[PDB]
Design a protein around this ligand. Structure first.
Ligand SMILES: CS[C@@H](Cn1nnc2cc(C#Cc3ccc(Cn4ccnc4CO)cc3)ccc21)N(O)C=O
Ligand SMILES: [Zn+2]
Length: 299
């Protein structure tokens, strides 16, 4: 059987919210079978619980925000990507503030935190959502699509408005084996252009941002002293974001995602459209892991 997974132990991290600039304490707690990823705001009385599900998304401007009443959890995409990548089904994420800490701007520190706490396989079949039919959404020149594929694959194209490393676009495609996410995606940091960042800062946004958690591109040159972790780090980061948004389906996907200048807003539109189109998907489990189209690393 491909089994559900949780953490073996509680683990803690601290960081700053990139948007809010607030110091936040993060606790990952093990959870039992069929819990899913549940976020909680520990700083509120009573404590408020928000399942990490498409129906709980309230804002998608520059990050995915979960909302329940007037209670928000901002920037869930990078932590959710790490959980998707490692195959964590069940976890409580307890936050002392309205934003997940940015860490280094990738999923790398979250996958390390999770793999340090250890993975616990549970005595229940892991649930997958299979893409049975193509589903697509467009808005102007932007496109996001689910395509049937016996496995998990994510393609992305981004269009910069000017030349960066002497071209206007980057494309990447990752056909996932057990090991692809940690090695080729997890370390891809978020990025901003200096002129955009200057504008975001003027409007009192990106208050936690720095070279320590973001690639800063001034014109066509990277300002970060040590440069890039991958040649195509920027498009690999959009693949990271997309895997985090896809996990709001609450079950691991069997199929292909393609993004063309997509972002959190259109990614979330795709998810809502797929969820509505019940003939395009079906929940499945694998009692024989050897015949399953997706493998996870050993726990
Ligand atoms: C959760 S992140 C999101 C994409 N996203 N959205 N907003 C963002 C803001 C930034 C930033 C930044 C920043 C970097 C350095 C500095 C210091 N500074 C300024 C000028 N000169 C200096 C050097 O002294 C100031 C701000 C990066 C990515 C962003 N994402 O990936 C969603 O998925
Ligand atoms: Zn991101």
């Amino acid at each position: 059987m491909i089994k559900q997974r949780t953490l073996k132990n509680i683990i803690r991290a601290t960081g700053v919210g990139l948007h809010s600039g607030e110091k936040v304490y993060l606790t990952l707690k093990p959870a039992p079978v069929d819990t899913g990823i549940v976020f909680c705001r520990t700083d509120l009385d009573p404590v408020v619980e928000i399942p990490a599900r498409a129906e709980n998304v309230g804002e998608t401007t520059m990050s995915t925000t979960l909302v329940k009443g007037d209670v928000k959890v901002d920037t869930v995409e990078h932590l959710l990507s790490a959980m998707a990548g490692l195959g964590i089904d069940n976890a409580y994420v307890e936050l002392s503030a309205s934003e997940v800490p940015i860490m280094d701007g990738s999923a790398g520190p979250f996958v390390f935190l999770i793999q340090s706490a250890g993975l616990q396989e549970q005595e229940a079949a892991k649930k997958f959502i299979r893409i049975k039919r193509e589903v697509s959404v467009e808005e102007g020149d932007k496109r996001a699509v689910f395509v049937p594929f016996d496995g998990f694959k994510v393609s992305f194209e981004i269009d910069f408005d000017h030349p960066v490393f002497r071209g206007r676009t980057q494309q990447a495609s990752v056909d996932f084996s057990s090991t692809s996410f940690v090695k080729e995606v997890s370390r891809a940091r978020t990025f901003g252009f200096m002129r955009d960042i200057e504008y975001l800062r003027s409007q009192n946004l990106a208050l936690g941002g720095s070279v320590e958690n973001a690639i800063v591109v001034d014109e066509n040159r990277v300002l970060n002293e040590d440069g890039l972790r991958y040649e195509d780090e920027f498009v690999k980061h959009k693949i990271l974001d997309a895997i985090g948004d896809l996990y709001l389906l609450g079950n691991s996907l069997i199929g292909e995602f393609r993004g063309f200048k997509s972002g959190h807003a259109l990614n979330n539109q795709l998810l809502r459209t797929l969820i509505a189109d019940k003939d395009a998907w079906e929940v499945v489990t694998f009692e024989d892991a050897r015949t399953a189209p997706i493998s996870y690393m050993r726990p």
